[PDB]
Amino acid sequence: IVISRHVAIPDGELEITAIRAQGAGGQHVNKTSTAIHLRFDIRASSLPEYYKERLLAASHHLISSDGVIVIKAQEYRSQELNREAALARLVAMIKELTTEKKARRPTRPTRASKERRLASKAQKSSVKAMRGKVRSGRE
RNA sequence: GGGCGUUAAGUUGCAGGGUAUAGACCCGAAACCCGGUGAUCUAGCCAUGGGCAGGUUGAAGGUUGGGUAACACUAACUGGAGGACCGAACCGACUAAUGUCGAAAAAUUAGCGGAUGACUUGUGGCUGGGGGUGAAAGGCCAAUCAAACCGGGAGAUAGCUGGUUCUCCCCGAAAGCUAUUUAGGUAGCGCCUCGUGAAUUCAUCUCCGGGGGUAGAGCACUGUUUCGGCAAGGGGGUCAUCCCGACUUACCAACCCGAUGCAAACUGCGAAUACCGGAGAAUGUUAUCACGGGAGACACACGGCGGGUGCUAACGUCCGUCGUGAAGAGGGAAACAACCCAGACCGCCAGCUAAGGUCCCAAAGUCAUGGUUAAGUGGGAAACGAUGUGGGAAGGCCCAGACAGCCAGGAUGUUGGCUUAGAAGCAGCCAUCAUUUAAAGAAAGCGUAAUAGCUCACUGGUCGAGUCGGCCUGCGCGGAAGA
RNA sequence: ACACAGGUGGUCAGGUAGAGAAUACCAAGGCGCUUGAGAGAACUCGGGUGAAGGAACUAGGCAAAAUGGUGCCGUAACUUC
RNA sequence: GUUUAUUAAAAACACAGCACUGUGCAAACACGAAAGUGGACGUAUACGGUGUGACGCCUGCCCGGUGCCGGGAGGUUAAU
RNA sequence: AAUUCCUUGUCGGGUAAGUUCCGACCUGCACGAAUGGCGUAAUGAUGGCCAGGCUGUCUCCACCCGAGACUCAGUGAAAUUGAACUCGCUGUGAAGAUGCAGUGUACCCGCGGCAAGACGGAAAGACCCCGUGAACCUUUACUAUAGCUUGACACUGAACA
RNA sequence: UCCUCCUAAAGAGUAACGGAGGAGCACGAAGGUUGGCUAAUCCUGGUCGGACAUCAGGAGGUUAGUGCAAUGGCAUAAGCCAGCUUGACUGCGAGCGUGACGGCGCGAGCAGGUGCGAAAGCAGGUCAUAGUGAUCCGGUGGUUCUGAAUGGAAGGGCCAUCGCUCAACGGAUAAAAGGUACUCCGGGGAUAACAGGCUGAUACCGCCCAAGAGUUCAUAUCGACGGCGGUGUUUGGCACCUCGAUGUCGGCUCAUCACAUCCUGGGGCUGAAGUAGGUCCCAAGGGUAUGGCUGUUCGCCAUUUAAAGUGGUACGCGAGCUGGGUUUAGAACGUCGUGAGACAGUUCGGUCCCUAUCUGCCGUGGGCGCUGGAGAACUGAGGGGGGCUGCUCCUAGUACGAGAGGACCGGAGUGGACGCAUCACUGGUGUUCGGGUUGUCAUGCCAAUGGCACUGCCCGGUAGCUAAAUGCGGAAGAGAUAAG
RNA sequence: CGACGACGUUGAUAGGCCGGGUGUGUAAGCGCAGCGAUGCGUUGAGCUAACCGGUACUAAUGAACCGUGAGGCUUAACCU
RNA sequence: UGCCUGGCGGCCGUAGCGCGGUGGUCCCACCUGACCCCAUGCCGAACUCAGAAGUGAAACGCCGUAGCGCCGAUGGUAGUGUGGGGUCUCCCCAUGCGAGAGUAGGGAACUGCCAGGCAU
RNA sequence: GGCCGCAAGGUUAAAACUCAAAUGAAUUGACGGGGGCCCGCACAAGCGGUGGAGCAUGUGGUUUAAUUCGAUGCAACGCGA
RNA sequence: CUUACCACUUUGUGAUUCAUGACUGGGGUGAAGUCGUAACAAGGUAACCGUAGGGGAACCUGCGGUUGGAUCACCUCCU
RNA sequence: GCCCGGAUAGCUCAGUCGGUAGAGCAGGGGAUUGAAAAUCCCCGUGUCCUCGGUUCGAUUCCGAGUCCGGGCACCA
RNA sequence: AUGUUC
Ligand SMILES: [Mg+2]
Ligand SMILES: [Mg+2]
Ligand SMILES: [Mg+2]
Ligand SMILES: [Mg+2]
Ligand SMILES: [Mg+2]
Ligand SMILES: [Mg+2]
Ligand SMILES: [Mg+2]
Ligand SMILES: [Mg+2]
Ligand SMILES: [Mg+2]
Ligand SMILES: [Mg+2]
Ligand SMILES: [Mg+2]
Ligand SMILES: [Mg+2]
Ligand SMILES: [Mg+2]
Ligand SMILES: [Mg+2]
Ligand SMILES: [Mg+2]
Ligand SMILES: [Mg+2]
Ligand SMILES: [Mg+2]
Ligand SMILES: [Mg+2]
Ligand SMILES: [Mg+2]
Ligand SMILES: [Mg+2]
Ligand SMILES: [Mg+2]
Ligand SMILES: [Mg+2]
Ligand SMILES: [Mg+2]
Ligand SMILES: [Mg+2]
Ligand SMILES: [Mg+2]
Ligand SMILES: [Mg+2]
Ligand SMILES: [Mg+2]
Ligand SMILES: [Mg+2]
Ligand SMILES: [Mg+2]
Ligand SMILES: [Mg+2]
Ligand SMILES: [Mg+2]
Ligand SMILES: [Mg+2]
Ligand SMILES: [Mg+2]
Ligand SMILES: [Mg+2]
Ligand SMILES: [Mg+2]
Ligand SMILES: [Mg+2]
Ligand SMILES: [Mg+2]
Ligand SMILES: [Mg+2]
Ligand SMILES: [Mg+2]
Ligand SMILES: [Mg+2]
Ligand SMILES: [Mg+2]
Ligand SMILES: [Mg+2]
Ligand SMILES: [Mg+2]
Ligand SMILES: [Mg+2]
Ligand SMILES: [Mg+2]
Ligand SMILES: [Mg+2]
Ligand SMILES: [Mg+2]
Ligand SMILES: [Mg+2]
Ligand SMILES: [Mg+2]
Ligand SMILES: [Mg+2]
Ligand SMILES: [Mg+2]
Ligand SMILES: [Mg+2]
Ligand SMILES: [Mg+2]
Ligand SMILES: [Mg+2]
Ligand SMILES: [Mg+2]
Ligand SMILES: [Mg+2]
Ligand SMILES: [Mg+2]
Ligand SMILES: [Mg+2]
Ligand SMILES: [Mg+2]
Ligand SMILES: [Mg+2]
Ligand SMILES: [Mg+2]
Ligand SMILES: [Mg+2]
Ligand SMILES: [Mg+2]
Ligand SMILES: [Mg+2]
Ligand SMILES: [Mg+2]
Ligand SMILES: [Mg+2]
Ligand SMILES: [Mg+2]
Ligand SMILES: [Mg+2]
Ligand SMILES: [Mg+2]
Ligand SMILES: [Mg+2]
Ligand SMILES: [Mg+2]
Ligand SMILES: [Mg+2]
Ligand SMILES: [Mg+2]
Ligand SMILES: [Mg+2]
Ligand SMILES: [Mg+2]
Ligand SMILES: [Mg+2]
Ligand SMILES: [Mg+2]
Ligand SMILES: [Mg+2]
Ligand SMILES: [Mg+2]
Ligand SMILES: [Mg+2]
Ligand SMILES: [Mg+2]
Ligand SMILES: [Mg+2]
Ligand SMILES: [Mg+2]
Ligand SMILES: [Mg+2]
Ligand SMILES: [Mg+2]
Ligand SMILES: [Mg+2]
Ligand SMILES: [Mg+2]
Ligand SMILES: [Mg+2]
Ligand SMILES: [Mg+2]
Ligand SMILES: [Mg+2]
Ligand SMILES: [Mg+2]
Ligand SMILES: [Mg+2]
Ligand SMILES: [Mg+2]
Ligand SMILES: [Mg+2]
Ligand SMILES: [Mg+2]
Ligand SMILES: [Mg+2]
Ligand SMILES: [Mg+2]
Ligand SMILES: [Mg+2]
Ligand SMILES: [Mg+2]
Ligand SMILES: [Mg+2]
Ligand SMILES: [Mg+2]
Ligand SMILES: [Mg+2]
Ligand SMILES: [Mg+2]
Ligand SMILES: [Mg+2]
Ligand SMILES: [Mg+2]
Ligand SMILES: [Mg+2]
Ligand SMILES: [Mg+2]
Ligand SMILES: [Mg+2]
Ligand SMILES: [Mg+2]
Ligand SMILES: [Mg+2]
Ligand SMILES: [Mg+2]
Ligand SMILES: [Mg+2]
Ligand SMILES: [Mg+2]
Ligand SMILES: [Mg+2]
Ligand SMILES: [Mg+2]
Ligand code: NA
Structure with missing residues (x-):
């Protein structure tokens, strides 16, 4: 009837009855209600x-x-x-259905990668600059 | 010195009790071992003959013709293989109903599976009991199978049930201890009976000598426990680094001191009662003790008292002591072994009583006297609640007028300066009658933010004579719902 | 054990319809199953029919109902062809 | 297909196939106190046992334990 | 899952509603490779689930046809059985009363029928315990033993290195 | 098995699967004797040295120690330290304690021979209680013993002593594990499972105090920490009955009772505007769902209903039915075990008997009675049956409310389920009426019929019986009450 | 099954018979058309169980049996 | 005969602590010395011996002192045997026995033999 | 998806989706744990040191109110100073 | 009135196609991450092709094949 | 409700029998490298769980608490 | 001898 330091199962809401089990046992299982129906x-x-x-x-x-x-x-x-x-099953299942997954913090790219990107940009640009058609003023 | 003897007369029959070996009080096993009869049912095999209506599919192959270098391959016709198909006889037994002192110790009715096969059946033969056979279930082996049937050992054994047969008379127990492959048996002892012998032996009561460590009590001691003082040492830091802080030395704090309790495994105390002795009177069918014959019994239950365990549950369980029942009838408790009275030798149409009772069932008081109860309490239940009703003692208020009614005032600074955007006589911590008269708050329940107000606490006027709570108490009531 | 709904090997095995030793009615042949007579209630047994619905019953479509023959057309996934 | 006749007919048993393994024939193995017989008038493409149970894809690691096979060096060891 | 306790796991499908079923996920309490693993057309009086059809299986049973049942005549058993002048209730009580206590009801006696009781009948309980009981069966329980196996001796001798 | 305390009731003893511990030894000094000595722990100073070393003094009182557990003791010390020594002797033992017995234990003193001491004296083990083993079978040594003709000897005896966690410790053998659901036999309710019983820890229900929540307010409602009961519904406890038998889950059919009431009926408080609720009293007359899954009671789910009550009755009912589960024998999977097998773990399959004598009950008669006999009609004691309720409408968009929404009270009508009655209708059946039709046999033959094939298969169908068909009923009212 | 109800010749109690109803559904025979199967006319005929209304035609027969003969006693209201 | 002291006994907290005072002719006590008998698990501290100078300081003994310890009645209560009763996991009645703690209070011991000294 | 295969697979043979490239030869260079020559205290041969201790000095770090700023590999760290 | 034809419709069983589905296999892209270095030089075991087996992955190994792989006389003569 | 083995540097563990702190990992600081690895040197770690009894001493011994896996909690 | 990566 207890979960954590603050959450407690007050037990005033725990309607347990006793039914007859399912399975073997002979003449005891037919006639001794032992399965706890909680x-x-x-x-x-x-x-x-x-x-x-x-x-x-x-x-x-x-x-x-x-x-x-x-x-x-x-x-x-x-x-x-x-x-x-x-x-025990109730405690366990309330524990498990009351634990929440941690909030995935989505990362940003690394600053090393940002500067690698900018350096690749500058390198291809430095090539393309001297690439292509040359300008002139003479004939 | 001590153990064993030393004094007694045995022995032979007869009858009896007991023991021992023989089956040994009778009946009763599951089984075990021998020696034999069984494979005319059944499991398998061997040999020799039988059975399988009818209707389906249609393989390999073969022929023919293509197609190929030849094969290969393909088409048509043919042919009829198959633990092949459908289905009767035949074999079997899947489902359901019936039947269950049946028609039948396993069938019958309606359906069902195989139905040319690893099939079925006739005749005969073979395999045999720890053996056979087994498409394996421990199945079958003559309605019998985790070791057949018959006979013998054998009347196995049985610490287990069941039964034990005519009469009278006397005494009359135990269900405990110890030990047990022992617990439901047994042996010794304790308890019973029949003899023998022995002493004031034993019992009862009185007095005397005693030792206890329980009840009780207590906390000197072992633990425990609550306070208050005493409290230094621990203690956070605001003890500042090597020295430390009169503040924290609030907290803790041993002991001590003063008190407060608790204990089966605590005792500085300590009974009653039992128990052991000594002595004495009276009584008791010598009831005491020793030996000898025979046992039974060693499953006890309840009730009271002291307790363990349980939950101060059990008609629970485990002990001690007593009693009863067992092994004891009768009266009583409606009935009711174990509770109360009381112990039946037989007869009586006599009487007195015990417990219990006296209106009727049902024998005896509508008895007498004094009270209580009003609920069928009596004639089921607790915490708790209640102006139920007796009794007591005491206290408070009262003819200077008591308590309750009655038309009725009771208040301005009192939104009090007051978290004051109210806690206004009555949501703030703070106080704040502080004048007025006999009285009246800087006031309770309400609009409560309060004015707008209600009553209210308190005094007066009439009425007038008891009244107020509180305690002990006796009997009562509610709490009190079940098939 | 019975004058017992059981078991028992082989031969013969007719007509009509049917593929047929199945089946239905019959011939040759044999028998009426060794207590009957009434009544026409529950209830049981073996049966027939059923409105409306159709597994809702149920352990479960057990049972019961249903389909059911010949000839012809067609006949899927899958496959060891 | 077979089974618990007489409550279980199945997923159980069998089964063709597969594998291990014993067996060289006076076979192994069995029934036999033995003779002998089955195996078999068979001869490793055959017999017996064991396990799995058509067909397809397959069958992985461990030899420490128990068993079987091989070794003989050494140790321990019987009768004598 | 013929293995899975938690468990009716979760998801999807199926149903209006599905602890079973089907398909997946794997957290396999405790699958797993010839004591086989996985799949598999056919086969199956095989087990689970579904749909179509079909119907008295069912709401909800109704009627009818026969055989019993019932009456008459004949023949005529059985299980059981201490005795019987054999009620209900509340309570007591070896603790679930026809018999006891108290009380209420009930003229004597059949016939058909139902089956709640008579701890009804049947079977000295097959469950459990006990016996210093038994059987079979298993095994690295004990003790042996068949059989298999080693060696010595004997039948079994000779020459040689 | 043994030792110690307590339980143990002040002699002894005294049990439990009651509460606490220990032993299966140790020591030739840890014994004897003579002599001597007296702690633990605090305080004050003192090299290291201090929390605590040995050092000195004071307080204390045995709060230490006793080789080991507890208890009883112990200062004359039984504690501590020294010298000598082996009386940790040998043969005996008056008496006594304790034991059922086997045994165990204390012992003054005697004879011998010793140690210590000066001597009186002490000493046959330790302060005591634990530290253990019966007999048999053997071993080894000694021996006034016996020695199978005699002398030897072997052997046997007596004495000493050795070998047994024979620890299940009074010790069954020198030598010992399991399954049986394939089971069998003797017994037990001496002893379990179900049921009944005693109890009520548990469960369920109620009540008391009530801090607090409830915009404020303990109580409209709930109730913390606690407390007192009741019921006999669960799980238990115990083992009283039953083991020469009381059949058990669920289902179906049949109910019956209680009220701690689910609806309907009457009320109180409400944080009750209305409808609707919440809670608490009264109340048992009646009613209280069909399905899917699972064998399921239980539960989830869908959909209803006014409500889908809680419980007892062998957790009702199997001489009423089923048998899915639990429980036989088959088989398998996972697991455990080497194996037989086992599993409140699954999975497929698996014989449910009874002719009713009595009680009871449902009907139905015979006898006799009731007083001459007989045929009728009745009064009515007394008993039984029945008693349920929805929706719509009007009241009325009225009361109320801000509006949505929406009455009480009182009427009407139609339903649901249940029951009674009946066959006029709708139908069913209707094998006893009529017809169609397949096959076949026969009536000589055609025709026509009849038999048989489930009534051959069918289509209709009268009367009767019937439900699904129709009519009717629940009352209204009065009396005396319940809560109020 | 007893029982209950009706009737027993002064009788409708049952059976039968007549008529009716109801149901089935156009009988057989005859004749016609058709080669025939068949169809058509007679012909809504035939049969019609329990139903309805009647009708003594048969059977419910005269009897016999049981039950009998004024009803106890005592007290009380009256003529006596 | 009376005082004091010593030794050994009775009894074993009325009998012991604590405070205060007193003793030295005798006895006791310390004390001198340790050369010797003898001892120190080292030390005339302890024992032991030989001695007497001083000391009544301690110790010892004596007298008051209750501050303490200790003893402790009468009553009452608890408990209990026996027999009844009950409101029965505990009580009551009758009778018998009668605590523990506490209270008033008591209480600064008494006593025997011998020896010595002192005073008679 | 088809045909083939016992099987592993083969063969026939796409599309969605993305990227502005993917590629072939060839030149210069750089690199090779490729080759061949050749050199430098590069190794070898030696001598002496540093890392070990103290100190001075400079940085990294931590601290501060700041511990000012800059070099930060060989080519900063007794550096600009 | 009836006979054949045929719409509409209802069956049953397929075929194809479209959308859809728990879960799953790969792919592509992003890529900031993790684990390795397989490839490119002899890429440090040459690579690659086929095929089979294995492994966490690049890949590794076996058999065969290709060069689209770099030096290739490191105790020698006189022949 | 217990019981079997258990509580050990920062971590995986060892390890005894009253007088233990031992291994390995890791970590830090160097060495190398252009730099991260990988390697090569140097460095030190606990009082052996909160405990509660014992002993002159507790991790070595007996009991509450973390409970590691678990084992059992079955029979009609 | 093997001996990774920016
Ligand atoms: Mg079981
Ligand atoms: Mg035997
Ligand atoms: Mg024979
Ligand atoms: Mg057949
Ligand atoms: Mg067939
Ligand atoms: Mg034969
Ligand atoms: Mg078996
Ligand atoms: Mg047989
Ligand atoms: Mg036998
Ligand atoms: Mg004999
Ligand atoms: Mg006999
Ligand atoms: Mg007598
Ligand atoms: Mg006994
Ligand atoms: Mg016995
Ligand atoms: Mg006491
Ligand atoms: Mg104390
Ligand atoms: Mg005591
Ligand atoms: Mg006994
Ligand atoms: Mg007796
Ligand atoms: Mg009596
Ligand atoms: Mg009597
Ligand atoms: Mg009487
Ligand atoms: Mg009574
Ligand atoms: Mg009362
Ligand atoms: Mg006959
Ligand atoms: Mg016959
Ligand atoms: Mg026939
Ligand atoms: Mg006959
Ligand atoms: Mg009939
Ligand atoms: Mg039918
Ligand atoms: Mg009909
Ligand atoms: Mg129908
Ligand atoms: Mg119909
Ligand atoms: Mg239908
Ligand atoms: Mg259903
Ligand atoms: Mg069927
Ligand atoms: Mg049929
Ligand atoms: Mg078959
Ligand atoms: Mg057979
Ligand atoms: Mg069978
Ligand atoms: Mg058979
Ligand atoms: Mg198999
Ligand atoms: Mg394998
Ligand atoms: Mg090996
Ligand atoms: Mg070998
Ligand atoms: Mg599931
Ligand atoms: Mg689902
Ligand atoms: Mg599945
Ligand atoms: Mg295997
Ligand atoms: Mg298999
Ligand atoms: Mg007769
Ligand atoms: Mg009764
Ligand atoms: Mg019957
Ligand atoms: Mg019976
Ligand atoms: Mg038996
Ligand atoms: Mg005693
Ligand atoms: Mg006593
Ligand atoms: Mg001494
Ligand atoms: Mg100091
Ligand atoms: Mg000693
Ligand atoms: Mg001792
Ligand atoms: Mg012996
Ligand atoms: Mg001789
Ligand atoms: Mg024993
Ligand atoms: Mg014993
Ligand atoms: Mg014994
Ligand atoms: Mg089995
Ligand atoms: Mg008994
Ligand atoms: Mg019971
Ligand atoms: Mg409040
Ligand atoms: Mg309240
Ligand atoms: Mg019993
Ligand atoms: Mg019990
Ligand atoms: Mg008992
Ligand atoms: Mg009973
Ligand atoms: Mg029984
Ligand atoms: Mg009520
Ligand atoms: Mg009533
Ligand atoms: Mg009424
Ligand atoms: Mg009712
Ligand atoms: Mg029960
Ligand atoms: Mg029942
Ligand atoms: Mg039955
Ligand atoms: Mg039942
Ligand atoms: Mg019954
Ligand atoms: Mg079956
Ligand atoms: Mg079944
Ligand atoms: Mg009634
Ligand atoms: Mg009519
Ligand atoms: Mg009709
Ligand atoms: Mg009709
Ligand atoms: Mg003819
Ligand atoms: Mg004709
Ligand atoms: Mg005929
Ligand atoms: Mg009809
Ligand atoms: Mg009324
Ligand atoms: Mg007529
Ligand atoms: Mg006509
Ligand atoms: Mg005509
Ligand atoms: Mg007194
Ligand atoms: Mg006193
Ligand atoms: Mg391809
Ligand atoms: Mg160099
Ligand atoms: Mg350095
Ligand atoms: Mg340096
Ligand atoms: Mg630079
Ligand atoms: Mg490579
Ligand atoms: Mg290389
Ligand atoms: Mg590499
Ligand atoms: Mg490479
Ligand atoms: Mg490899
Ligand atoms: Mg524990
Ligand atoms: Mg590095
Ligand atoms: Mg280290
Ligand atoms: Mg990396
Ligand atoms: Na091996």
């Missing part, structure tokens, strides 16, 4: 802004069209493991 609204949730407008904007299999982080944690057996695991 639901976590995003819009009306009291996380800081710049989180809501980013989570809702991004497209991820967990977050629904109503804007609810949906987790189906059934990778472990007992509800303590599944609850800690679903909370």
